[PDB]
Structures are given as C-alpha cells and as structure tokens.
Design a protein around this motif. Structure first.
Motif, mmCIF file in Angstrom:
data_model
loop_
_atom_site.group_PDB
_atom_site.id
_atom_site.type_symbol
_atom_site.label_atom_id
_atom_site.label_comp_id
_atom_site.label_asym_id
_atom_site.label_seq_id
_atom_site.Cartn_x
_atom_site.Cartn_y
_atom_site.Cartn_z
ATOM 1 N N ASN A 1 54.433 40.322 48.768
ATOM 2 C CA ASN A 1 53.937 41.669 48.986
ATOM 3 C C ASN A 1 54.887 42.653 48.330
ATOM 4 N N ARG A 2 54.335 43.514 47.473
ATOM 5 C CA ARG A 2 55.001 44.511 46.635
ATOM 6 C C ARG A 2 56.059 43.945 45.688
ATOM 7 N N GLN B 1 22.340 33.689 46.363
ATOM 8 C CA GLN B 1 22.694 34.972 45.731
ATOM 9 C C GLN B 1 22.474 36.185 46.640
ATOM 10 N N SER B 2 23.003 36.119 47.859
ATOM 11 C CA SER B 2 22.770 37.144 48.869
ATOM 12 C C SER B 2 24.090 37.687 49.388
ATOM 13 N N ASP B 3 24.140 38.991 49.638
ATOM 14 C CA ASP B 3 25.377 39.694 49.947
ATOM 15 C C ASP B 3 25.520 39.967 51.437
ATOM 16 N N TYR C 1 34.581 30.139 40.334
ATOM 17 C CA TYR C 1 34.734 30.200 38.889
ATOM 18 C C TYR C 1 34.417 31.557 38.275
ATOM 19 N N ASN D 1 24.574 28.205 40.876
ATOM 20 C CA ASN D 1 25.519 29.315 40.862
ATOM 21 C C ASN D 1 25.193 30.278 41.999
ATOM 22 N N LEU D 2 25.757 30.014 43.174
ATOM 23 C CA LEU D 2 25.673 30.964 44.272
ATOM 24 C C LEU D 2 26.543 32.170 43.963
ATOM 25 N N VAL D 3 26.164 33.329 44.506
ATOM 26 C CA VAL D 3 26.920 34.544 44.191
ATOM 27 C C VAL D 3 26.895 35.483 45.396
ATOM 28 N N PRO D 4 27.901 35.361 46.252
ATOM 29 C CA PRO D 4 28.148 36.398 47.237
ATOM 30 C C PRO D 4 28.707 37.627 46.538
ATOM 31 N N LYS D 5 28.414 38.809 47.081
ATOM 32 C CA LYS D 5 28.960 40.032 46.480
ATOM 33 C C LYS D 5 29.218 41.049 47.590
ATOM 34 N N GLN D 6 30.429 41.022 48.127
ATOM 35 C CA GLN D 6 30.747 41.881 49.250
ATOM 36 C C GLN D 6 31.133 43.270 48.757
ATOM 37 N N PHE E 1 47.049 49.067 43.333
ATOM 38 C CA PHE E 1 46.723 47.653 43.203
ATOM 39 C C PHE E 1 46.109 47.134 44.491
ATOM 40 N N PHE E 2 45.042 46.350 44.381
ATOM 41 C CA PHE E 2 44.625 45.496 45.484
ATOM 42 C C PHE E 2 45.079 44.063 45.292
ATOM 43 N N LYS E 3 45.095 43.350 46.408
ATOM 44 C CA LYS E 3 45.488 41.953 46.482
ATOM 45 C C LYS E 3 44.521 41.275 47.439
ATOM 46 N N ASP F 1 45.541 46.357 50.082
ATOM 47 C CA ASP F 1 46.016 47.263 49.050
ATOM 48 C C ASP F 1 47.522 47.420 49.150
ATOM 49 N N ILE F 2 48.135 47.783 48.034
ATOM 50 C CA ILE F 2 49.441 48.413 47.974
ATOM 51 C C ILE F 2 49.251 49.678 47.156
ATOM 52 N N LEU G 1 52.703 39.607 41.621
ATOM 53 C CA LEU G 1 51.297 39.340 41.857
ATOM 54 C C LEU G 1 50.833 38.317 40.837
#
Lengths: 50, 117, 150
Positions: free
Chosen positions: B56-57, C28-30, C148, A15-20, C131-133, C123-124, B60
């Motif tokens: 878009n808008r 597990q690195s950001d 997942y 389970n890799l986990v990037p977190k930006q 809301f973000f998209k 964003d909108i 979603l």
C-alpha cells in the motif's frame, strides 16, 4: 500438470463478462499543511527513514 | 537468472515493465515431474524488511506475482512496477516448485536495485 | 398393465441434436440475476412457458412472484429477485408445433447463478495524481476462475 492449456482453449471457452460499477468514493475538504522540524540529539543519530 | 530492467532512475508517476530472464539447467535432470515451477518476486526496501503483498502506497503491480516458468527453455516473465512515493527499492526472486509451504528449494541472489525520485 | 415396478431398464430415448428445441442459459450480466433462452428454429415457432418450479419461491419475480410465460420470444432477460437461496429449479416447456404435429417438450433445468469474481476496491490519493488498486477474488472456495481481461 501443464499440457499448454491455452493452445486448446479459444475454440470452446465461453466468454462471461461481469461488469461492476466503480464508486470513486471520497470526501470533500481540500486544504494543506507544512510542518517543519529539526532533530534534537538523544543517544546518537539512528539513520531515520520516511 | 538475470534481471533486465528499463531504467533505475524513474520518477513517481510512471509505469515500468520488469523482465526477469530464467535459464533452466542441465541439472534439472533429477526430477522432470513438475515441468511447471512456481517462482515468486519479493521486493526489499534496501534497508531490511520486505513489503507485504498489499504494498500500500509503495509499489503497484498487475496480477499475482507467482508467474510460472518451465523446466524446458529460457522462459520470460513480467510485471508492471507502477511506482508510487518511494526511493531506492530492490527486486529479487525465489523458486518454490509447488504452491505449498516448504516447497521452496532455492533463493537467488540477483538483487537489481532501482531508485525513485 | 405392465406392472414393472422395478427390474428393467426404464427409459430409452436420447436428446439428440439436429432438431428444433429450446435452450436456456445465462451470460454477460452485471450483478443482477437473469436468464437467457435461445430458440434455434424456423417457420413460426409458437409460444413457450417458463415456470417457477421451486419448493418455496426463493427465485422470485419483481412484484408478484410469477412465472410469466413468454409468447414468440426467443431471447430475453428474466430479471428476477433473490429471496435467500443459492440454488433453484426451472421447469421450461415449449409448444414447438412445426407442421401438422403438436411438438412439445418439458425440461426441468436446475440453474444456480451466484456470482463468482468477487471484486473489492481501494484508492490511494496523492497530490494531483490518483490511483486505484483492485482486489480480485473468487466467491466460491476451491473452484478456480481464469481471467483474461480487466
């Protein structure tokens, strides 16, 4: 093609986990407006959509 | 295919599970090869001219809509139509068998419409 | 001198399990490149090396482009920098030395650690709701990514 690969997945898949970050990037000037309108006939009403 | 929906009369800021229900047939006996079969979900405006993938808008959703089914039994599927700033949409599917172009083999006609106030 | 320049089998030993060794990986690195060693041993394993076995030192350290060999360190995070490459090498040595036998090793691993799940935003913004998209994409071409949670 698809041998139900989620059945034999969880035993060995790491389970890799990037977190930006997430910026919520924006600008700053709040105001409002409200223009009002009334259509003047050209040809016939065309059934306008917003 | 039927399309099972929660409400047709939702307001703007609300989240809706959509649930298609598919029934594979007796006359799938011609192939059996790809048991997996790729659908799509396409969204029409109830005038003409379907919205793009980048809706878009308008609407979603969670994840790519391709969302496979089996040629085995009554599979189910889902999306999360998080509506935004709309009225009077339409949902329908198609069946594509594969990923490539000219893989598409049928277009169903089940067109469940919902309104947004 | 055997003088076997060719015409034989060369090397006849195997890296089996059930033995105390070293294992260096990354998880597990950001968005900032690192590494993680692992020491599955017992009873006072000694120090170890972590060299920079590159040609021109693209897998650079922070200030001075060093190797910085550890000492009684099992798991850590070598927060490197990136001087314009997408491949590397890492000669790793570890004086194990369990009991009356100067046990050593030298594994020249080849870890390349560019990111995969390249994610863009949009964003909108409506009146008192927001809301973000999120766009989600794989930075490599035609090597696939399963996903997942988000």
């Amino acid at each position: 093609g698809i041998a139900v690969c989620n059945t034999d997945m969880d035993e060995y898949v790491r389970n890799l986990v990037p977190k930006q970050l997430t910026v919520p990037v924006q600008l700053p000037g709040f105001e409002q407006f409200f223009h009002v309108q009334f259509e003047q006939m050209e040809t016939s009403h065309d059934a306008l959509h917003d | 295919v039927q399309l099972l929906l929660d409400e047709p009369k939702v307001k703007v800021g609300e989240i809706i599970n959509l649930k298609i229900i598919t029934e594979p047939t007796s006359t799938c006996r011609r192939k059996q090869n790809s048991t997996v079969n790729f659908l799509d979900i396409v969204i029409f405006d109830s005038k003409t001219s379907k919205i793009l993938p980048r809706s878009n808008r308008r609407i979603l959703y969670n994840g790519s809509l391709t969302k496979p089914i089996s040629t085995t039994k009554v599979s189910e599927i889902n999306l999360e139509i998080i509506p935004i700033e709309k009225g009077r949409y339409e949902f329908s599917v198609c069946i594509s068998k594969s990923n490539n172009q000219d893989g598409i083999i049928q277009f169903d006609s089940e067109n469940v419409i919902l309104s947004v106030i | 001198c055997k003088e076997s320049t060719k015409v034989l089998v060369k090397q006849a030993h195997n890296l089996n399990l059930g033995e105390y060794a070293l294992e260096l990986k990354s998880v597990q690195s950001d968005a900032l490149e690192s590494l993680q060693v692992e020491v599955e041993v017992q009873k006072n394993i000694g120090n170890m090396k972590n060299l920079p076995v590159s040609f021109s030192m693209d897998e650079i350290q922070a200030r001075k482009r060093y190797n910085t060999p550890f000492e009684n360190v099992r798991l850590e995070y070598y927060l490197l920098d990136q001087i314009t490459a997408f491949d590397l090498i890492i000669k790793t040595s570890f004086t194990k030395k369990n009991d009356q036998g100067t046990f050593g090793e030298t594994k020249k691993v080849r870890i390349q650690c560019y990111l995969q799940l390249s994610v863009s935003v949009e964003d909108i913004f409506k009146k008192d709701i927001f809301f973000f998209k999120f766009l989600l994409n794989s930075s490599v071409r035609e090597e696939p990514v399963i996903l997942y949670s988000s």
